[PDB]
From a paper:
Bacterial infections including Salmonellosis and Shigellosis affect millions of people every year. These bacteria use a T3SS to secrete virulence factors to manipulate host cells. The T3SS is a multi-component system that forms a continuous protein transport channel through the two bacterial membranes and the periplasmatic space that extends into the surrounding medium by a needle structure. Tip proteins, which bind to the distal end of the T3SS needle, are thought to play an important role in this process. SipD from S. typhimurium, IpaD from Shigella flexneri and BipD from Burkholderia mallei are tip proteins that are thought to interact with their corresponding needle subunits PrgI, MxiH and BsaL, respectively, to make the needle tip complex.
Here, we address the questions of how the Salmonella SipD interacts with PrgI and deoxycholate and the mechanistic consequences of the assembly of the T3SS needle tip complex. We could show that two different proteins, structurally conserved in many pathogenic bacteria, bind each other to constitute the needle tip of the transport system. Multiple copies of both proteins constitute the tip of the transport system in what may represent the open state of the needle.
Residue numbers in the entry: 6 to 77, 129 to 178, 186 to 335
The structure:
Amino acid sequence: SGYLDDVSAKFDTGVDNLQTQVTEALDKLAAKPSDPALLAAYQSKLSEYNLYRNAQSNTVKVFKDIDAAIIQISDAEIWDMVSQNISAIGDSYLGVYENVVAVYTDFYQAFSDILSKMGGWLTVKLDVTSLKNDLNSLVNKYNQINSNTVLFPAQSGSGVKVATEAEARQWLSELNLPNSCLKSYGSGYVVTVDLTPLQKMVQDIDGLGAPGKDSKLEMDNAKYQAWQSGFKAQEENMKTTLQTLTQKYSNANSLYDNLVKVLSSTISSSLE
């Protein structure tokens, strides 16, 4: 509709550039495989590329609203009007990250609850059975597909919402989660919490050996320290996953704010 074609066509150039940048970022990383900086740069670019492809596949719905509102102009007002007419984007980008962090925070919080009754389970004697049982119930509970376990899509109220394999895999790589987090359900797929640290924990408790009639098992300090160390390490792993996803979210808010600035500029300029 008039300038809209100008915003979109100029916008497509953006997707091409990011696409090129992603590859370029990836090659720099290929030269130094374990370089943290280059990895972070590449994934921010990947996320950003996905964001623009998001916007692109929503131009109709979005240009509709924005245009309808341009028809009832300041620049801080262009920005404002753009800000409140791109929910199709923010909800499938930021809203997704919002859900990802809330769900993972509750998942972790549930683990914390189990950790909170360790004293009541402690040479030294550990309640192998009681501990392993609480862990296994956590594994099974979060190994299912419901509102407490799904990171993407966001589960809106009642009923399970799925996505295509491609969409789920896209989020799987952006969230940097492992294959075990991708599950099939009905017509499509979903991305859930990573249970690997928890499963390693029980796998470690079993390595401790068969418990006594106590259903508990006494062990000499040597192997106790080694066990609790291995256990605390798995906990830090979950805690690290929660932090990295929180950091991805904060980065996405920034990338999103820059997409809105660009969108606003192209529109404001398409007038002049």
